């Protein structure tokens, strides 16, 4: 649901997410991590996720992240920078 | 001849209106002749020697009324008379002290590069004597040392050296450059340095300088809770900016072929 | 990649309403979200933790450069 930024979250939120005590969640997060359904990177500084591979069963809403919220908008930015490479070296392109 | 300009020398200028009348008559002297278009006609230059004396007293009047733009014009004009080759020009008691006053004035406007330029301007005066010239050169040694530490010594160095108005300007030009440090609660008292702005441990007079515009100069975080200074810091996010710099330099190395 | 890759993603972003209007469905063909999520192996926004690694990729980029 959250890629980076909000993906990182406090242990207490995971404690609420696992419906378990925050002290218990230090033990509980490890059990949830153990299932390892999705391979990722997890930091226990705040139990923040910021992990790697994940498989969503389906995308939320109308894939709003897939629109200019994340994708497409970044792609528009790249072509302008590609034009900057052309402007930087038009003669070299020949 | 050309009286009133030299006529009021005994009564210098109790009235500021007299200075204005003197300026109008000086303008009439400019109508008669330019300050120094050429070095020819040394007799006209001898008339300009009388003009130098009235300008020198006029500059003292400008300091007495604390004029800045008019004083700047007069000071530049006095420097131009010294600029005039006029080998015939006689030694002037007013000229030696006023050049020293100009050296102090440069500190007042914070022209530090110029202040050394003025120390250079009179090498023979600086030598060891010219006590009027010596007080600003000693002040310059104190200024690089930090005028704050020796400001009390500088203030009492001469009760009167013809710099009485100029020492008041020196009090006006008290340095507050020490402001970029922790103060108020974190340091609480900076009176130890002895600069007038940070002088006094906590009284309202100290508070007026200390809490001016909230805190001294007034920009930046309040000194009481200030993190030592601006504390801007730096990041390695610049690598993306450095990647943009890499595009320009790398493309050029290829561009040369 | 800047334009043609954007154009196919743009077709799906248009499809969020256009697939509703004429497309089979914005929420359809699992790979529409599954493959896009595979493409979003990198997070896509904010912290990212890719070129912002600092001690990791950034330090290596300097050593090799």
Coordinates of C-alpha atoms in Angstrom, one line a residue:
Chain A
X1 CA 0.0 0.0 0.0
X2 CA 2.8 2.4 0.9
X3 CA 6.1 2.4 -1.1
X4 CA 8.8 4.0 1.1
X5 CA 8.0 6.9 3.5
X6 CA 4.7 5.8 5.0
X7 CA 5.8 2.1 4.4
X8 CA 8.2 2.8 7.2
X9 CA 6.0 2.9 10.4
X10 CA 6.3 2.8 14.2
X11 CA 6.3 -0.5 16.2
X12 CA 3.2 0.7 18.1
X13 CA 1.3 1.0 14.7
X14 CA 2.4 -2.7 14.0
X15 CA 1.2 -3.5 17.6
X16 CA -2.2 -2.0 16.7
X17 CA -1.9 -3.8 13.3
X18 CA -1.2 -7.2 15.1
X19 CA -3.7 -6.1 17.8
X20 CA -1.0 -6.9 20.4
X21 CA 0.8 -4.8 23.2
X22 CA 3.7 -2.6 22.0
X23 CA 6.1 -4.5 24.4
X24 CA 4.6 -7.7 23.0
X25 CA 5.0 -6.5 19.4
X26 CA 8.8 -6.5 19.8
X27 CA 8.2 -10.3 20.2
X28 CA 5.2 -10.3 17.8
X29 CA 6.8 -8.4 14.8
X30 CA 9.5 -11.2 14.6
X31 CA 6.7 -13.9 14.3
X32 CA 5.0 -11.8 11.6
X33 CA 8.4 -11.3 9.9
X34 CA 9.0 -15.0 10.2
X35 CA 6.2 -16.0 7.8
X36 CA 8.3 -14.2 5.2
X37 CA 5.5 -14.5 2.6
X38 CA 7.2 -11.6 0.7
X39 CA 11.0 -11.1 0.6
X40 CA 12.0 -7.6 2.0
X41 CA 14.3 -5.5 4.1
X42 CA 13.0 -4.7 7.7
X43 CA 14.6 -2.4 10.3
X44 CA 13.7 -2.8 14.0
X45 CA 14.8 0.8 14.9
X46 CA 11.1 1.7 14.8
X47 CA 10.0 -1.6 13.2
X48 CA 9.8 0.5 10.0
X49 CA 9.4 -1.7 6.9
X50 CA 10.9 0.0 3.7
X51 CA 11.1 -3.6 2.4
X52 CA 11.9 -5.1 -1.1
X53 CA 9.6 -7.5 -3.0
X54 CA 5.9 -7.7 -2.2
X55 CA 2.9 -9.2 -4.1
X56 CA -0.4 -7.3 -3.8
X57 CA -3.5 -9.5 -4.5
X58 CA -5.0 -6.5 -6.3
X59 CA -4.3 -2.7 -6.4
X60 CA -6.3 -0.4 -4.0
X61 CA -9.0 2.0 -5.4
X62 CA -8.5 2.8 -9.2
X63 CA -4.6 2.3 -9.0
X64 CA -4.3 6.0 -8.1
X65 CA -0.6 5.4 -7.4
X66 CA -0.3 4.0 -10.9
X67 CA -1.4 7.4 -12.3
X68 CA 0.5 10.8 -11.9
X69 CA 0.5 10.2 -8.1
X70 CA 3.6 8.0 -8.7
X71 CA 4.0 6.6 -12.2
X72 CA 3.6 8.5 -15.5
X73 CA 4.4 11.9 -13.8
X74 CA 8.0 10.7 -13.1
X75 CA 8.2 9.4 -16.7
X76 CA 7.1 12.9 -18.0
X77 CA 10.0 14.4 -15.9
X78 CA 12.5 12.0 -17.5
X79 CA 11.8 13.0 -21.2
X80 CA 12.4 16.7 -20.3
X81 CA 15.8 15.6 -18.8
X82 CA 16.4 13.5 -22.0
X83 CA 15.9 16.8 -24.0
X84 CA 18.5 18.4 -21.6
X85 CA 21.0 15.6 -22.7
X86 CA 20.1 16.5 -26.4
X87 CA 20.6 20.2 -25.7
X88 CA 23.8 19.5 -23.8
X89 CA 25.2 17.6 -26.8
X90 CA 23.3 18.2 -30.0
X91 CA 26.4 18.3 -32.2
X92 CA 27.6 15.0 -30.8
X93 CA 24.3 13.3 -31.7
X94 CA 24.9 14.2 -35.4
Chain B
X1 CA 39.7 88.4 -0.2
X2 CA 36.9 85.8 -0.4
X3 CA 35.9 86.7 3.3
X4 CA 33.1 85.1 5.4
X5 CA 34.5 81.7 4.2
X6 CA 37.6 82.7 6.2
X7 CA 35.7 85.4 8.2
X8 CA 33.8 82.9 10.4
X9 CA 37.0 80.9 11.4
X10 CA 37.1 82.5 14.9
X11 CA 33.3 81.7 15.4
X12 CA 33.8 78.4 13.5
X13 CA 30.0 77.4 13.3
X14 CA 27.8 77.6 16.5
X15 CA 24.9 77.9 14.0
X16 CA 24.3 75.1 11.4
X17 CA 22.9 77.9 9.1
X18 CA 26.4 79.4 9.1
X19 CA 27.6 76.1 7.6
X20 CA 24.9 76.3 4.9
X21 CA 25.9 79.9 4.1
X22 CA 29.6 78.7 3.9
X23 CA 28.5 76.0 1.5
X24 CA 26.8 78.6 -0.8
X25 CA 30.0 80.8 -0.8
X26 CA 32.1 77.7 -1.4
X27 CA 29.8 77.0 -4.4
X28 CA 30.6 80.6 -5.5
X29 CA 34.3 79.7 -5.2
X30 CA 33.6 76.7 -7.5
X31 CA 31.9 79.2 -9.9
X32 CA 35.1 81.3 -9.8
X33 CA 37.4 78.2 -10.5
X34 CA 37.1 74.4 -10.7
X35 CA 38.8 72.5 -7.8
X36 CA 41.9 71.5 -9.8
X37 CA 41.2 71.1 -13.6
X38 CA 44.9 71.5 -14.4
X39 CA 48.2 72.0 -12.4
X40 CA 48.8 75.3 -14.2
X41 CA 48.3 78.8 -12.6
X42 CA 49.9 77.9 -9.2
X43 CA 48.7 81.4 -7.9
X44 CA 45.1 80.2 -8.4
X45 CA 46.2 77.0 -6.6
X46 CA 47.5 79.4 -3.8
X47 CA 43.9 80.7 -3.6
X48 CA 42.8 77.0 -3.4
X49 CA 45.3 76.6 -0.4
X50 CA 43.1 79.2 1.5
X51 CA 40.1 77.1 0.3
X52 CA 41.7 73.9 1.8
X53 CA 41.8 75.5 5.3
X54 CA 38.1 76.6 5.1
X55 CA 37.2 73.0 3.8
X56 CA 39.2 71.4 6.7
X57 CA 37.2 73.5 9.3
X58 CA 34.0 72.8 7.2
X59 CA 34.6 69.0 7.5
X60 CA 34.9 69.5 11.3
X61 CA 31.5 71.3 11.2
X62 CA 30.1 68.3 9.1
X63 CA 31.2 66.0 12.0
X64 CA 29.8 68.5 14.5
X65 CA 26.3 68.2 12.8
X66 CA 27.0 64.5 12.1
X67 CA 26.5 65.1 8.3
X68 CA 27.1 61.9 6.2
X69 CA 26.5 62.7 2.4
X70 CA 27.8 66.3 2.7
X71 CA 30.8 65.1 4.8
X72 CA 31.5 62.4 2.2
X73 CA 31.6 65.1 -0.5
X74 CA 33.8 67.4 1.7
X75 CA 36.2 64.5 2.7
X76 CA 36.6 63.5 -1.0
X77 CA 37.2 67.2 -1.9
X78 CA 39.8 67.4 0.9
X79 CA 41.5 64.2 -0.4
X80 CA 41.5 65.8 -3.9
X81 CA 43.3 68.9 -2.5
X82 CA 45.9 66.5 -1.1
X83 CA 45.6 64.8 -4.6
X84 CA 46.6 68.1 -6.2
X85 CA 50.3 68.0 -7.0
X86 CA 50.7 71.5 -5.5
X87 CA 54.3 71.1 -4.4
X88 CA 53.9 74.7 -3.0
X89 CA 51.2 73.4 -0.6
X90 CA 52.5 74.1 3.0
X91 CA 52.3 71.6 5.9
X92 CA 48.8 71.9 7.5
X93 CA 48.2 71.1 11.2
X94 CA 44.5 70.5 10.3
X95 CA 45.5 68.2 7.4
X96 CA 47.4 65.7 9.5
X97 CA 44.7 65.2 12.2
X98 CA 41.8 65.1 9.7
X99 CA 43.6 62.4 7.6
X100 CA 43.7 60.5 10.9
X101 CA 40.0 61.4 11.4
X102 CA 39.3 60.0 7.9
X103 CA 41.1 56.8 8.9
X104 CA 38.8 56.5 12.0
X105 CA 35.8 57.4 9.7
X106 CA 36.7 54.4 7.4
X107 CA 36.2 52.1 10.5
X108 CA 32.8 53.8 11.1
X109 CA 31.6 52.9 7.6
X110 CA 33.2 49.4 7.9
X111 CA 35.5 50.0 4.9
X112 CA 38.2 47.6 6.3
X113 CA 40.1 47.3 2.9
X114 CA 40.1 51.1 2.7
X115 CA 41.2 51.4 6.4
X116 CA 44.4 49.7 5.5
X117 CA 44.5 51.7 2.2
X118 CA 44.5 54.9 4.5
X119 CA 47.2 53.4 6.8
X120 CA 49.1 53.0 3.5
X121 CA 48.1 56.5 2.4
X122 CA 50.3 58.2 5.0
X123 CA 53.4 56.0 5.4
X124 CA 55.6 58.9 6.5
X125 CA 52.9 60.0 9.0
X126 CA 52.5 56.5 10.3
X127 CA 56.3 56.0 10.9
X128 CA 56.2 56.4 14.7
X129 CA 54.9 60.0 15.3
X130 CA 51.6 61.8 14.3
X131 CA 49.9 60.8 17.5
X132 CA 46.5 61.8 15.9
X133 CA 47.3 59.3 13.0
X134 CA 48.6 56.8 15.6
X135 CA 45.3 56.4 17.5
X136 CA 43.4 54.9 14.5
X137 CA 46.4 52.6 13.6
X138 CA 46.5 51.4 17.2
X139 CA 42.7 51.0 16.9
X140 CA 43.3 49.0 13.7
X141 CA 45.6 46.6 15.6
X142 CA 42.8 46.4 18.3
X143 CA 40.2 45.9 15.5
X144 CA 41.9 42.8 14.0
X145 CA 42.5 41.7 17.6
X146 CA 38.8 42.4 18.1
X147 CA 37.9 46.0 19.1
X148 CA 35.6 44.5 21.8
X149 CA 38.5 43.3 24.0
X150 CA 40.4 46.7 23.9
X151 CA 37.4 49.0 23.3
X152 CA 37.5 50.3 26.9
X153 CA 41.3 51.1 26.4
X154 CA 40.6 52.7 23.0
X155 CA 37.7 54.9 24.5
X156 CA 40.0 56.2 27.3
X157 CA 43.2 56.2 25.1
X158 CA 42.8 60.0 24.4
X159 CA 40.2 62.2 26.3
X160 CA 40.6 64.8 23.4
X161 CA 42.8 64.3 20.3
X162 CA 40.5 66.5 18.1
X163 CA 38.7 63.1 17.7
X164 CA 36.0 64.0 20.3
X165 CA 33.2 63.8 17.7
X166 CA 35.1 60.9 16.0
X167 CA 35.4 58.9 19.3
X168 CA 31.6 59.3 19.6
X169 CA 31.4 57.8 16.0
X170 CA 33.8 55.1 17.3
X171 CA 31.3 54.4 20.1
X172 CA 28.6 54.3 17.3
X173 CA 30.8 51.8 15.3
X174 CA 31.2 49.5 18.3
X175 CA 31.6 46.0 16.7
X176 CA 28.8 43.5 17.3
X177 CA 30.3 40.9 14.9
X178 CA 30.7 38.6 18.0
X179 CA 26.9 38.1 17.8
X180 CA 27.4 34.8 15.9
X181 CA 27.8 32.8 19.1
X182 CA 25.6 31.2 21.9
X183 CA 24.1 33.9 24.3
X184 CA 21.2 34.5 26.7
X185 CA 20.7 31.6 29.2
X186 CA 22.9 29.3 27.1
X187 CA 25.8 31.8 27.7
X188 CA 23.6 34.3 29.7
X189 CA 26.4 37.0 30.0
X190 CA 28.8 38.2 27.3
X191 CA 29.9 41.3 29.3
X192 CA 33.4 39.7 29.8
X193 CA 34.5 40.8 26.2
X194 CA 33.6 44.4 27.2
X195 CA 32.1 45.4 23.8
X196 CA 29.3 48.0 24.5
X197 CA 26.5 45.9 22.8
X198 CA 27.3 42.8 25.0
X199 CA 28.6 45.0 27.9
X200 CA 26.6 44.7 31.3
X201 CA 25.7 41.3 32.6
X202 CA 21.8 41.6 32.6
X203 CA 20.6 45.3 33.2
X204 CA 18.0 47.0 30.9
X205 CA 20.7 49.0 29.2
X206 CA 22.5 45.7 28.3
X207 CA 19.0 44.3 27.6
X208 CA 18.3 47.1 25.1
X209 CA 21.3 46.1 23.0
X210 CA 20.9 42.4 23.9
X211 CA 17.1 42.2 23.1
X212 CA 17.1 44.9 20.3
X213 CA 14.7 43.6 17.6
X214 CA 14.0 40.8 20.1
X215 CA 17.7 39.7 20.0
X216 CA 20.6 42.1 19.1
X217 CA 20.5 42.5 15.3
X218 CA 17.2 40.6 15.4
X219 CA 17.4 38.1 12.3
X220 CA 17.9 34.3 12.9
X221 CA 16.7 32.2 15.9
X222 CA 16.3 33.9 19.3
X223 CA 19.8 33.7 21.0
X224 CA 18.3 32.3 24.3
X225 CA 17.1 29.1 22.4
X226 CA 19.5 29.5 19.4
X227 CA 21.3 26.2 18.4
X228 CA 24.7 28.0 18.9
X229 CA 24.2 29.5 15.4
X230 CA 22.1 29.0 12.1
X231 CA 23.3 25.3 12.3
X232 CA 22.5 24.8 8.5
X233 CA 24.4 21.4 8.2
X234 CA 24.9 19.5 4.9
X235 CA 23.5 16.2 3.3
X236 CA 24.7 13.5 0.8
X237 CA 21.5 14.0 -1.2
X238 CA 23.7 16.4 -3.4
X239 CA 24.9 13.2 -5.1
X240 CA 21.8 13.5 -7.4
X241 CA 22.8 17.2 -7.9
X242 CA 26.4 15.9 -8.4
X243 CA 24.9 13.5 -10.9
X244 CA 23.5 16.6 -12.7
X245 CA 27.1 18.2 -12.5
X246 CA 28.4 14.8 -13.8
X247 CA 26.2 15.1 -16.9
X248 CA 27.8 18.5 -17.8
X249 CA 31.4 17.6 -17.2
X250 CA 31.3 14.0 -18.6
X251 CA 29.3 15.1 -21.8
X252 CA 32.0 17.8 -22.4
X253 CA 34.9 15.2 -22.2
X254 CA 33.0 13.2 -24.9
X255 CA 32.1 16.5 -26.7
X256 CA 35.8 17.3 -27.2
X257 CA 36.1 13.8 -29.0
Chain C
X1 CA 11.9 4.9 -22.2
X2 CA 11.1 8.6 -21.3
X3 CA 8.3 8.8 -23.9
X4 CA 7.3 5.3 -25.2
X5 CA 7.4 3.8 -21.6
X6 CA 5.5 6.8 -20.4
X7 CA 3.0 6.3 -23.2
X8 CA 2.0 2.7 -22.2
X9 CA 1.8 3.8 -18.5
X10 CA -0.2 6.9 -19.7
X11 CA -2.6 4.5 -21.5
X12 CA -3.2 2.7 -18.1
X13 CA -3.4 6.1 -16.3
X14 CA -6.0 7.2 -18.9
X15 CA -7.5 3.7 -18.5
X16 CA -8.3 4.5 -14.8
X17 CA -11.3 6.4 -16.3
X18 CA -10.9 5.3 -20.0
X19 CA -10.8 1.5 -19.2
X20 CA -13.9 2.2 -17.2
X21 CA -15.3 4.1 -20.2
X22 CA -14.1 1.7 -23.1
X23 CA -11.4 -0.6 -21.7
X24 CA -12.1 -4.1 -20.3
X25 CA -11.6 -2.8 -16.7
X26 CA -8.9 -0.6 -14.9
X27 CA -9.2 -3.4 -12.2
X28 CA -8.7 -6.3 -14.7
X29 CA -5.9 -8.6 -16.2
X30 CA -4.0 -9.2 -12.9
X31 CA -0.7 -8.2 -14.7
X32 CA -2.1 -4.7 -15.1
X33 CA -1.4 -4.3 -11.3
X34 CA 0.8 -7.3 -10.7
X35 CA 3.4 -6.5 -13.5
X36 CA 3.1 -2.7 -12.6
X37 CA 3.9 -3.6 -9.0
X38 CA 6.8 -5.8 -10.3
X39 CA 7.9 -2.6 -12.2
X40 CA 7.4 -0.8 -8.9
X41 CA 10.1 -3.0 -7.4
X42 CA 11.5 0.4 -6.6
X43 CA 9.0 2.2 -4.3
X44 CA 8.4 5.1 -6.9
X45 CA 7.9 8.1 -4.5
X46 CA 9.3 10.0 -1.4
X47 CA 12.0 8.2 0.6
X48 CA 12.6 5.6 -2.1
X49 CA 15.8 4.2 -0.3
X50 CA 17.5 3.7 -3.7
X51 CA 19.8 6.6 -4.6
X52 CA 19.0 8.0 -1.1
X53 CA 20.9 5.0 0.4
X54 CA 23.8 7.4 1.3
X55 CA 26.2 4.9 3.0
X56 CA 25.2 2.3 0.4
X57 CA 24.6 3.1 -3.3
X58 CA 25.8 6.7 -3.0
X59 CA 29.1 5.8 -1.4
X60 CA 29.7 3.1 -4.0
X61 CA 28.8 5.5 -6.8
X62 CA 31.6 7.8 -5.7
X63 CA 34.2 5.0 -5.4
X64 CA 33.6 3.7 -8.9
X65 CA 33.2 7.2 -10.4

